[PDB]
Amino acid sequence: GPVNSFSGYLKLTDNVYIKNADIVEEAKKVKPTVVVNAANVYLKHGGGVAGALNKATNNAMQVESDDYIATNGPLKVGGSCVLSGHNLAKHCLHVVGPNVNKGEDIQLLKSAYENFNQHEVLLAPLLSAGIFGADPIHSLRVCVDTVRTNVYLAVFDKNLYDKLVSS
Numbered sequence: 001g002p003v004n005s006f007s008g009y010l011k012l013t014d015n016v017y018i019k020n021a022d023i024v025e026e027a028k029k030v031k032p033t034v035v036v037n038a039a040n041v042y043l044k045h046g047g048g049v050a051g052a053l054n055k056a057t058n059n060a061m062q063v064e065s066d067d068y069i070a071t072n073g074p075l076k077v078g079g080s081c082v083l084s085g086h087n088l089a090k091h092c093l094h095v096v097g098p099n100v101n102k103g104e105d106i107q108l109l110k111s112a113y114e115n116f117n118q119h120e121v122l123l124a125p126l127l128s129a130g131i132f133g134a135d136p137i138h139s140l141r142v143c144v145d146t147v148r149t150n151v152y153l154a155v156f157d158k159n160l161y162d163k164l165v166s167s
C-alpha cells in the first residue's frame, strides 16, 4: 500500500530529515506508511496539525478518534495510539506531546518521541511546538536525540524553518 516517496528533504542526522512544507500536502504526495499527528489526550482534533489532518480526511479521523476514546479512555501525555491513516497514509500515529504552557512536564517530550521508534519511517511535525508552547528548537533537539528510526519533518512556516536549519 504505502510507498514513502519523500523528496526535497534536508538531511540533519542519519535518521532525521526536514523540509519546509505543508504536512497535509506532503502526505498526499509521499503516501507514507505512517503520518504523525500532534494530538491531545482526548484526540479532539480542533486545530493546528490535528485540525488540518482531520479536515483532509473529511472528518473521518475525528469520528474514528471519538469512537476510540469513548471506548478506551483518553491517552497518556507522552503516550500514543495507532489509528487509520484514511486517505493520507496507511496508519496515523497520534502522539500527545506535553502541554508546556499549561504546566505539563516538558520531559515527556522524550517519551512522546520514543513512540516514533516503533515505526521504520514516519512523516511527522514537531511535537508540542504549536499551542502547547514548547520551543520548536528544543522540540527538534529532543527529536534528534530520541528518534532512532527515519523521521521526515514538515515545518509549515518558512521563517521558523530557516531558524531551525541554522540552529
Ligand SMILES: Cn1c(=O)c2nc(SCCC(=O)NS(=O)(=O)CCN3CCOCC3)[nH]c2n(C)c1=O
Binding pocket: 021, 022, 023, 024, 038, 039, 040, 044, 045, 046, 047, 048, 049, 050, 051, 052, 097, 125, 126, 127, 128, 129, 130, 131, 132, 133, 154, 155, 156
Ligand atoms: C498545516 N500545518 C500546521 O498547521 C502546522 N502547525 C504546526 S506546529 C507543530 C504541531 C503542533 O501543533 N503540535 S501541538 O502544540 O502539540 C498541537 C496541540 N493541539 C492541542 C489541541 O488539539 C490538537 C493538538 N506545524 C504545522 N505544519 C507542519 C503544518 O503543515
